[PDB]
Design a protein around this ligand. Structure first.
Ligand SMILES: CN1Cc2c(n(C[C@H](N)C(=O)O)c(=O)[nH]c2=O)C1
Ligand SMILES: [Cl-]
Ligand SMILES: [Cl-]
Ligand SMILES: [Zn+2]
Length: 254
């Protein structure tokens, strides 16, 4: 019996400040796939909400102490009721928060420029001339830091041996791929969005893993199962199909 606090962070095309000449306030400041998703969920489940951006602007990772940051920490501390963002469902996080069923499936892949002999993650691990990395304190960095596969634990050694290999956010990683000889380990959903608007970048290889995005809630929250039921309803109504195609404009790349 009160409006739910929704934590999130800005990232194209999921959550962005809507462009306008007038000054906007409240939830109307935001647009994007995740904003449309929250609006549909709020209508089905019938709740009011307030969008708040996570202060540290991080998704969530654990330090060497076991403490969380980013949106994950907001849920653990019960400072937010829902986390509506491209929040990756991982087994590790399931022990600290609850996830709905996934509303989007994805995988880790590689962002790099076109016209190159590189075709796999193993090609990056076999050399040191081409730098590579990932976003700091994200599920992608966590995947390489926790991996027990020889190739990935070697790539993680290379990522953690260079100070600027791990970037603060997507924009820094994208710009580094453009200005330097650098490949970015990034989730396939954003790669699709970028390669559709930058014809000089492409996805290298396929998906290194397979996972999904889910709505995060504090552990034991009753809204988790309700959000799952709402997500399934949106799938059945083909509304998640429309939403992706609305915000993934298309490849104008010949
Ligand atoms: C959609 N973006 C692209 C992207 C994201 N994250 C955060 C991750 N979803 C999480 O929940 O921590 C990454 O770790 N690597 C990426 O390339 C979110
Ligand atoms: Cl995992
Ligand atoms: Cl696009
Ligand atoms: Zn697509």
């Amino acid at each position: 019996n009160r409006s739910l606090i929704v934590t999130t962070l800005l990232e194209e095309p999921f959550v962005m400040f809507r462009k306008s000449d007038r000054t906007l306030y409240g939830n109307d400041r935001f647009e994007g796939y995740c904003i449309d998703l929250l609006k549909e969920l709020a209508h089905i489940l019938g709740f009011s909400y307030e969008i708040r951006l996570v202060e540290d602007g991080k998704y969530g990772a654990q330090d060497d102490k076991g403490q969380w940051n980013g949106m994950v920490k907001e849920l653990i501390d019960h400072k937010a009721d829902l986390a509506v963002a491209p929040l990756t469902i991982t087994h590790v996080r399931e022990k600290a928060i609850d996830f709905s069923k996934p509303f989007m499936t994805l995988g880790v892949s590689i962002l790099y420029r076109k016209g190159t002999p590189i075709d796999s993650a193993d090609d990056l691990a076999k050399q040191t001339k081409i730098e590579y990395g990932a976003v700091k304190d994200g599920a992608t960095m966590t995947f390489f830091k926790k991996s027990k596969i020889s190739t990935f634990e070697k790539m993680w050694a290379f990522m953690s041996s260079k100070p600027s290999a791990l970037v603060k956010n997507n924009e820094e990683g994208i710009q580094r791929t453009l200005t330097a000889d650098y490949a970015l380990l990034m989730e396939s959903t954003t790669i699709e969005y970028i390669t559709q608007r930058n014809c000089n970048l492409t996805q290298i290889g396929g998906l290194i893993d397979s996972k999904g995005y889910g709505i995060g809630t504090p552990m034991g929250s009753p809204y988790r199962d309700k959000i799952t039921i709402a997500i399934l309803q949106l799938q059945e109504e083909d509304k998640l199909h429309i939403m992706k195609e609305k915000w993934w404009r298309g490849s104008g790349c010949p």
